[PDB]
Design a protein around this ligand. Structure first.
Ligand code: MYR
Ligand code: MYR
Ligand code: MYR
Ligand code: MYR
Ligand code: MYR
Ligand code: MYR
Ligand code: MYR
Length: 582
């Protein structure tokens, strides 16, 4: 293209252009104020219009990287506020952008973004809508500089819909606060999801990612031929390889290239991609990534023919092992959309281990004739774990299901900090509530996606403040073995109970005048410390202590004098539980 800036403006549209340029500036210049960035965005946008007007205008033939880096290098405070990052301007084009990207600070030390009160938010939404959402877009971008810029925009667009709807509702807080929470969880999950994919790419290599890709693409596109899924695995692998490097423009191009190829070959890939492929270039690749699984062919035979009983199984394996294993993973995944990707990866790993051992034996065909039986216990293990917990979720609420996990996982790794234990257990129970509402066919893929988010957060929190070697092993093993490693955690018998601290089990009147969440988290914090103090306590004893606690908190703010009931009745509750335990 003659003018790269002109085309992107022509296709993104002015609004998408300014917002993406705002995000881009924020992720590079994370310390500059909002007003400074708006000025750069407007200047870049005004210049972009000259290129749309005449692509031959001055500097309109420069590349986006060149033009973007020039504007960064015009910042007056570059050396004062970012220091070493101002040395990037002494370099040009390839080396300059790579220098700037290297100086992206993934975790800057900016203050916590406080969510204002609803009435303040709705008033700022109406008095200045553009400035309201745009500043927040700037605040999030600068705090997540590797967050893919379109997805960051895509979430921001949904925030406007939440405010428009709820700011005119009867109970605005009842409408808005849940939606802001879903989006905030949706975004933090997505952020952790791509950074996790990149770490796994560089920690376990391209081969392991290509295995994961065959499984995920074959489930999604089960009518697609193996040669087709294979080609899409290689392209998607280069896309993620480049996007993990971190340059927005090359990532956007690689994603748009693949999203274009898939859309021009829908007849050979999937039926579900028409609506996605009619969306603008900005949304194409994101839409395709969220497309639902296509229906698999009706009468597909079992895999026993080509992979177990047929002669040449070892011959076809040894001529090109990753081709053969890829064919096995493709055939298995496309028939089992109800399996998690890591489950199918466990299956291919077992199939690979069997062929390697058996093809070296005297009678290989006899050695691997029973290989399909080795898959069953691997398949049943998550399926049974889903039913135990979803049945447990049906019996209890989401809250009381969280309380069960609270007790369960405190006994397994009691060394984990109480805030991490409360947060991760609350999140795990929420994985239950969401995924246990899906029929059997959709339960395990649900759990894998949302367990990967919760467990990674657990492993992120644990990496920075190590406290348990077993959790470290689960966090450093293959992602395929992550969840089964955590599910293999047994109760820590070497733990010595934590010493009783009366102030930890002392409650004041603040508990009854608290938000439903802080009230739950404070009750759940006291539950963790209760288990940490009497770990060998049975469920009848604990249920008895939680039952007396329910009446204790129910009555002390059901009385005329609330403040001192909590200390006097708390002295009654704690001493009785002390005797009822140990
Ligand atoms: C990542 C997309 C934009 C994120 C900014 C949220 C939308 C701005 C309106 C203010 C909402 C408060 C944000 C929050 O507390 O979750
Ligand atoms: C006949 C066309 C050749 C296509 C080759 C595709 C190879 C797929 C790579 C993924 C192999 C996964 C094997 C594994 O690690 O378990
Ligand atoms: C740095 C140049 C300023 C404008 C930013 C270019 C737009 C980035 C996203 C382009 C659309 C990518 C769509 C996709 O993910 O496939
Ligand atoms: C982080 C999303 C990667 C962007 C490239 C995806 C291009 C469309 C292929 C989507 C097929 C499913 C692969 C996936 O799970 O992301
Ligand atoms: C507290 C957990 C609630 C949801 C129950 C899910 C337990 C089974 C997860 C195993 C399937 C995840 C993917 C896998 O490991 O194959
Ligand atoms: C750090 C406390 C341990 C964290 C617990 C991680 C377990 C993830 C859910 C595993 C599936 C639910 C049932 C199980 O543990 O077998
Ligand atoms: C050893 C001192 C005993 C006090 C320990 C109190 C433990 C609080 C359990 C949390 C209450 C669960 C019931 C609920 O939140 O509805």
């Amino acid at each position: 293209h003659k003018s790269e800036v002109a085309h992107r403006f022509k296709d993104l549209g002015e609004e998408n252009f300014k917002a993406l340029v705002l995000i881009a500036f924020a992720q590079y210049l994370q310390q500059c104020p909002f007003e400074d960035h708006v000025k750069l965005v407007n200047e870049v946008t005004e210049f972009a219009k000259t290129c749309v007007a005449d692509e031959s205008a001055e500097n309109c033939d420069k590349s986006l990287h060149t033009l973007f880096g020039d504007k960064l290098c015009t910042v007056a405070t570059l050396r004062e506020t970012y220091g070493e990052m101002a040395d990037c301007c002494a370099k040009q084009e390839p080396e300059r952008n790579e220098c700037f990207l290297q100086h992206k600070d993934d975790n800057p030390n900016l203050p916590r973004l406080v969510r204002p009160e609803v009435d303040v938010m709705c008033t700022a939404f109406h008095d200045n809508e553009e400035t309201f959402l745009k500043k927040y877009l700037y605040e999030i971008a600068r705090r997540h500089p590797y967050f893919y810029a379109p997805e960051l925009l895509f979430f921001a667009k949904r925030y406007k819909a939440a405010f428009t709807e709820c700011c005119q509702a009867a109970d605005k807080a009842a409408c808005l606060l849940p939606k802001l929470d879903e989006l905030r969880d949706e975004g933090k999950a997505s952020s952790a999801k791509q950074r996790l994919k990149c770490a796994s790419l560089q920690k376990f290599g391209e081969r392991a990612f290509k295995a994961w890709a065959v499984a995920r693409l074959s489930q999604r596109f089960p009518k697609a031929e193996f040669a087709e899924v294979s080609k899409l695995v290689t392209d998607l692998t280069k896309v993620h390889t480049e996007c993990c490097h971190g340059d927005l423009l090359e990532c956007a191009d690689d994603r748009a290239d693949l999203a274009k190829y898939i859309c021009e070959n829908q007849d050979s890939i999937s039926s579900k991609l028409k609506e996605c492929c009619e969306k603008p270039l900005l949304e194409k690749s994101h839409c395709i990534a969220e497309v639902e699984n296509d229906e698999m062919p009706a009468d597909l035979p079992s895999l026993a023919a080509d992979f177990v009983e047929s002669k040449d199984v070892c011959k076809n394996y040894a001529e090109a092992k990753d081709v053969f294993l890829g064919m096995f993973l493709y055939e298995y995944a496309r028939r089992h959309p109800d399996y998690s990707v890591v489950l199918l990866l466990r299956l291919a790993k077992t199939y690979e281990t069997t062929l390697e051992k058996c093809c070296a034996a005297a009678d290989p065909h006899e050695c691997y004739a029973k290989v399909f039986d080795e898959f069953k216990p691997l398949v049943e293990e998550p399926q049974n774990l889903i039913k135990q917990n979803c049945e447990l979720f049906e019996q209890l609420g989401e809250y009381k299901f969280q309380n069960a996990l609270l007790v369960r996982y405190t006994k397994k790794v009691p060394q984990v900090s109480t805030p991490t234990l409360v947060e991760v257990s609350r999140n795990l129970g929420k994985v239950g509530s969401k995924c246990c509402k899906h029929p059997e066919a959709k339960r395990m893929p649900c759990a894998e996606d949302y367990l990967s988010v919760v467990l990674n957060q657990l492993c992120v929190l644990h990496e920075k403040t190590p406290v348990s070697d077993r959790v470290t092993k689960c966090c450093t093993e293959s992602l395929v073995n992550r969840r089964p490693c955590f599910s293999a955690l047994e109760v820590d018998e070497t733990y010595v109970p934590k010493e009783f601290n009366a102030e930890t089990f002392t409650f004041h009147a603040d508990i009854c005048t608290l938000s439903e969440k802080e009230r739950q988290i404070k009750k759940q914090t006291a539950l963790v410390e209760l288990v940490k103090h009497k770990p060998k306590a049975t469920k009848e004893q604990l249920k008895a202590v939680m039952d007396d606690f329910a009446a204790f908190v129910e009555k002390c703010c059901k009385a005329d004098d609330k403040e001192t009931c909590f200390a006097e009745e708390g002295k009654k509750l704690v001493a009785a539980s002390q005797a009822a335990l140990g």
